[PDB]
């Protein structure tokens with residue numbers, strides 16, 4: 506580790522801790538925005554393209570229903586998500602611009618990234634070439650180096666959470682499972698195909714789960730499908746815990762070697778969790794052509810630029826029923842969300 510990297514990360518941690526200890530709160534309100542379109546929807550919230558009525562800027566507004574967050578046992582997770590997002594700063598992490606709450610909902614107003622999910626692009630082309638997968642993987646490696654140095658675990662890496670920006674670079678979204686952890690944590694969360702064995706087996710786990718998930722992501726980008734696939738989750742879990750993985754013959758030997766070390770079922774032997782930390786990944790032969798500083802500085806020409814007409818274009822996102830944003834006349838769950 507060059508003193509240069511050490512000093513960068515020391516400053517990053519100082520700046521994160523100052524915002525972590527004194528979080529911003531209540532920095533806009535709903536009637537500052539016009540609603541444009543629903544971009545995504547889930548069991549306790551949705552994301553909406555909105556336009557600020559005074560500046561004209563577009564944003565992605567995540568709206569969480571407090572009562573559904575409580576029912577689905579996501580209180581601490583939603584508090585983690587906002588407290589972390591308002592404190593971080595890195596080129597490949599989506600920016601939180603405003604946050605607020607009302608009688609019914611929590612609101613996180615983020616930069617709008619018009620290029621769409623990596624998932625859509627991957628499914629449309631089939632698979633990414635190794636150089637193309639490597640460009641995205643390098644951004645995730647650097648992002649995890651940053652997050653883990655702050656004692657943060659991400660826990661939701663998957664192609665649907667990685668958006669492609671106007672320059673073709675990644676923006677990581679969805680901090681709903683991110684957590685500040687010194688040592689181990691225990692919650693069962695994440696998407697089946699991406700879960701590390703130690704999550705499935707109900708162990709106290711650490712940042713090594715993010716490095717496992719990177720292995721799954723690289724495999725899926727390069728093959729077009731994930732390494733452990735089945736019709737039902739329990740069948741997926743049996744494959745994950747087995748210690749067996751099959752690689753397409755078109756994978757390079759270097760790619761297969763990196764993946765065996767990320768998809769290592771013994772967490773004490775897994776790349777990213779050894780004495781040399783992230784450098785076992787950054788120095789691997791599969792990354793020999795990667796200029797880490799040039800990626801960080803966004804000086805590498807991207808594999809593709811998404812096609813879109815302007816900052817309000819939604820063509821790279823898909824269509825959802827447009828439902829009301831109702832705000833109750835009575836405050837709900839005020840105590841639970843006091844710190845938001």
Ligand SMILES: O=S(=O)(c1cccc2cnccc12)N1CCCNCC1
Pocket residue numbers: 544545546552553565567599615616617618619622665666668678679822
């Ligand atoms: O609309 S999003 O939730 C989304 C979340 C957070 C920030 C965003 C910024 N720009 C666009 C979409 C965004 N998104 C697409 C549909 C669902 N998959 C996850 C990514």
